[PDB]
């Protein structure tokens, strides 16, 4: 119940934290996927499709980190926590 967020505040932080144990885990859970998406874009020209690209269809020039956060909020990824 609120106005639609605009900017780097979308998706809302509370919904993201509802999935991850804590924000310290969420930052890594997002950054590693951003790195994966960036690597996929880098190897888009030619290479083995070992790193699957973005799951949710990206927008017009959306940064990889934003795509990672959106696809995390959409409940399409699963992560395992070390120790």
């Amino acid at each position: 119940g609120y106005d639609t967020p605009l900017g780097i505040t979308n998706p809302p932080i509370d919904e993201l934290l509802d999935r991850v144990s804590s924000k310290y885990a969420l930052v890594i859970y997002a950054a590693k996927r951003a790195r994966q998406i960036n690597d996929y874009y880098n190897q888009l020209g030619e290479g083995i499709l070992e790193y699957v690209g973005p799951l949710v269809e990206p927008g017009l020039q959306e940064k990889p980190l934003s795509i990672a956060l959106r696809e995390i909020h959409a409940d399409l990824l699963e992560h395992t926590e070390g120790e």
């Binding site: 699957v52 799951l55 399409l76 990824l77 699963e78």
Partner: peptide, 9 residues
Amino acid sequence: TEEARAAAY
């Protein structure tokens, strides 16, 4: 997740 990969393409 495996479902997302299966439905990706």
